[PDB]
């Protein structure tokens, strides 16, 4: 009875190295909005805060609080949305806008999140979780592809996805509403960039 999103819903986590259409149903997420370079402290803190909350929720089964509707779950891969506002140059990593996200089971409500922030304040006092929010949404119709290799080469994968959209008659909705979406299967701090695996997912209509 432990949820493992990667196994039970593998299609969302294991595309091949070619573009495919995918419909992404409603999911529940912890999210942190932020700005700037992923090498910077703000992004690192965002990721740390998400994991602090997710593991506080998961490990609640070993404490004295029974969360309503609790199910154990394998913490899923980190994901991110990426967009810009105003005139923008890609080389300008400080201008990047993003949201860092972790999927959660349905039982995670605002009340569960508030409880986890309080527990984490005690157990993990150096992590500020105040910007973590809970967002449920249906990402919907997308194209996705596994990108193997450095982030600087993602343009190759994105271009192939764009060509697939043309071939299939799909409109590219990517922008500031339906956002460019990465799912990180590798830890970029520990992985050889040449062998990193990242899902790139772009919304379509
Ligand atoms: C109690 O039990 C547990 C608690 C636990 N916590 C964690 C955990 O915290 N984890 C795992 C892991 C992912 C993670 C993290 C901590 C982190 O601070 C962190 N940073 C990154 C990171 O930096 N990432 C991921 C994305 C990203 C980077 C990165 O380097 C970049 O290069 C600059 C990036 N460039 C770009 C682009 O260019 S996009 C265009 C994107 C991007 C990843 C993680 C694990 C754990 C296990 C437990 O059992």
Numbering used by the authors: 4 to 208
From the study:
Here, we show an additional level of resistance regarding YTM cyclopropyl hydrolysis catalyzed by a subfamily of GyrI-like proteins exemplified by YtkR7, a gene product coded for within the same biosynthetic gene cluster of 1. We define this subfamily of GyrI-like proteins as cyclopropanoid cyclopropyl hydrolases (CCHs), and demonstrate that they share a conserved aromatic cage for the hydrolysis of 1 and 2, and thereby confer cellular protection. The GyrI-like proteins possess a duplicate βαββ configuration and appear to have been adapted for small-molecule binding. To probe the catalytic mechanism of CCHs, we carried out co-crystallography and molecular dynamics (MD) simulation experiments on lin2189, a CCH protein from Listeria innocua that can hydrolyze both 1 and 2.
Co-crystallization of native lin2189 with 1 or 5 turned out to be extremely difficult, owing, respectively, to rapid hydrolysis and low affinity. Interestingly, this variant lost the enzymatic activity and allowed us to obtain a complex structure of lin2189 E185L and 1 in which the electron density for the substrate is partially visible. Detailed investigation of the electron density map implicated that several residues in the solvent-accessible channel (e.g., E157) potentially interfered with substrate binding. Therefore, we designed a series of variants based on E185L. As expected, we successfully solved the complex structure of a catalytically deficient form lin2189 E157A E185L and 1 with complete density at a resolution of 1.2 Å. The structure is composed of two monomers, each of which binds one molecule of 1 at the crevice. The 1L- and 1M-subunits of 1 are stretched into an aromatic cage consisting of Y46, W85, W99, F154, and Y187, while the 1R-subunit is exposed to the solvent and stabilized by Y54 and Y58 through π–π stacking interactions. Surprisingly, we did not observe any catalytic residues close to the cyclopropane moiety, which is contrary to canonical ring opening mechanisms that require general acid/base. However, the reactive methylene group in the cyclopropyl ring was next to the acidic residue E185 (4.5 Å) that is very close to another acidic residue E157 (2.8 Å), providing a likely electrostatic mechanism to explain both our difficulty in crystallizing the native complex and our ability to crystallize the double-mutant form. The importance of the catalytic pocket to hydrolysis activity is further strengthened by the fact that the catalytic residues are very highly conserved among CCHs, and mutagenesis experiments confirmed that the acidic residues E157 and E185 are essential for the catalysis.
